[PDB]
C-alpha cells in the first residue's frame, strides 16, 4: 500500500517554452495538473498527497491565492487542506484566509492534501529545533533527553503516514531542499515527464515502481 | 573538470552479487573489498576532495575491524581518513584503534575518504542539535539565532566541500537514512550495477553525468 505520496512539481516554464508560449500558460497548465493528480490521488484511496510547487526556472503568495477558489469543492470531497512551509510574511490578510482554509477542512476524513508554499526541508528542521531549544531554555527539557522521535514530534507531518513515495517531474535528479527528514526510507521516483503533461499513467507507473519495490 | 568535489556512495548489492554467484554472503563481501579499494584509487586519481561510503546491503563493527587492515595503505596513498557514525558504544579497543588511524593520517593531502559506521542521516541531525541544545543551556546560545546556517555549522562533514553527487548501486531507489540534511543539493545517481561490478568506468559516468547534468 502507497500511503502517502509526495511530488516535486517541475516542469512548468519548461512546457510554457516548448508550447511557444509566455510562462504564465505554463502555469495554468500546471494547476490543471494538480486538481487531476488531487482527484487521481482521493480516487485511488491515497491517505495523503503532499505537492512542492517548484520550478527549475511572491510568485508563491500568488500560488495560494490560485488555490483559494478551489477550496469550497476541496471541502466537498472531504479532503483535509493544510499549507506546510513559512507563510509568517505573507500579507495577513492571506494568512488569515488560509488559516480559515485549513479550519473548514480540518474535520474531514478523505485525502490529506499539504500543499508546501515557501517551504524548505531545512526550514522545516530548523523549526522543530528552535522549539526544542526554547523548551531548553525553559529549564523544560534536557540536551540528553532529545532523540529521534522527539525531533520527529516536531517536525511538519508528524501526525500523518510516514512519505512512501516522492515523485519528481520535468528531468533533475535532486531533491532540492523539499523534505529532507521525512523521506530518510521513501522510494524516489524522477520521470522526464513535464509537471503539466504528468497524467494518470503517470502516476499510475510511479506507484508500481513502489509496490515493485 | 566533472565538476565533483565530494561523491557519497551507498554500496548495496553485494549478498546479491555473491547470490548469482552460488557463493555465500562473505564472497560478496571480500569482493565488494576489492571494489572499495578500487573506488577509492579511482577518486583519489580524478581529484575528487572528499568520498564519503556507506556500508549497506538490503557485521558494522566486523566491517570497521576489516578496514583495521587497510589503514597503512590508505596512509601510504595520501588518504586523509575519518570514521563517521555513532561509535561511542563500540567498545573501547575498537574506540582506540579507531583514534589512532584518524590522527595517523589526518596530515595527509590527498583524498579525504569517511566511512559511515552506525551512521544514520536522522542520528546525525539529532547529535547537532544536541550539540545547540547544550549550548543553549550553558547560556552561551539564544534559541532564536539558530539557523539553517548554524545548524550546517554542527552536522557530520560541515567543514569539507558540500555533497555534489550521491551513487547508490545494486538497484533500490532510496536513500535508506544515509545523508539527509546535507544530501538537499546534491545530483541522485542510482545505478543496477551491483556493487562488487561497480568499476572505473561505471564511477566514471556517474561523474560524466553529473558533468552533464549540472
Ligand atoms: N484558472 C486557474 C487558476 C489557478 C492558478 C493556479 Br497557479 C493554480 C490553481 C489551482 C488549483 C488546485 C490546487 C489544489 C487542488 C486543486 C484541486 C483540486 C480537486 C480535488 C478533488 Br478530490 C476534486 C476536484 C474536483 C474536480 N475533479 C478538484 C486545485 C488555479
Ligand atoms: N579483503 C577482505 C578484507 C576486507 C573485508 C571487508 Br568486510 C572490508 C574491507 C575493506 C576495506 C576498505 C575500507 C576503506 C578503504 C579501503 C581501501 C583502499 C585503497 C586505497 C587506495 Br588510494 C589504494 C589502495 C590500494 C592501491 N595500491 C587501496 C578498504 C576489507
Redesign the pocket.
Same mark, same amino acid.
Given at each position: 500500500g502507497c500511503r502517502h505520496v509526495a511530488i516535486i512539481m517541475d516542469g512548468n516554464g519548461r512546457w510554457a517554452k516548448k508550447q511557444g508560449k509566455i510562462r504564465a500558460f505554463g502555469?495554468?497548465a500546471? *494547476?490543471?495538473s494538480? /486538481?487531476?493528480a488531487?482527484?487521481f *490521488?482521493?480516487?485511488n484511496g491515497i491517505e495523503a498527497l503532499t505537492?512542492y510547487?517548484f520550478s527549475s526556472e511572491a510568485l508563491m503568495e500568488?500560488?495560494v491565492?490560485?488555490?483559494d477558489?478551489?477550496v469550497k469543492?476541496?471541502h /466537498?470531497?472531504?479532503?483535509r487542506?493544510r499549507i506546510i512551509g513559512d507563510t509568517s510574511r505573507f500579507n495577513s490578510r492571506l494568512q488569515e484566509r488560509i488559516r480559515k482554509s485549513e479550519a473548514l477542512t480540518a474535520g474531514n476524513t478523505?485525502?490529506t492534501?499539504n500543499?508546501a508554499a515557501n517551504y524548505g526541508g531545512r526550514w522545516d528542521i530548523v523549526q522543530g529545533v528552535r522549539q526544542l531549544a526554547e523548551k531548553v531554555q525553559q529549564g523544560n527539557l534536557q540536551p540528553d533527553q532529545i532523540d529521534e522521535e522527539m525531533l520527529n514530534q516536531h517536525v511538519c507531518m508528524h501526525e500523518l503516514a510516514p512519505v512512501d513515495l516522492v515523485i519528481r517531474t520535468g528531468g533533475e535528479h535532486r531533491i532540492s531542499n523539499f523534505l529532507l527528514w521525512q523521506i530518510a526510507y521513501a522510494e524516489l521516483y524522477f520521470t522526464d515527464v513535464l509537471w503539466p503533461d504528468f497524467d494518470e499513467q503517470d502516476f499510475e507507473g510511479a506507484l508500481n515502481a513502489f509496490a515493485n519495490r
Open positions: 502555469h495554468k500546471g *494547476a490543471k494538480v /486538481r487531476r488531487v482527484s *490521488a482521493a480516487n505537492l510547487a500568488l500560488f491565492w490560485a488555490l477558489s478551489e469543492s476541496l /466537498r470531497h472531504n479532503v487542506l478523505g485525502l492534501l500543499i
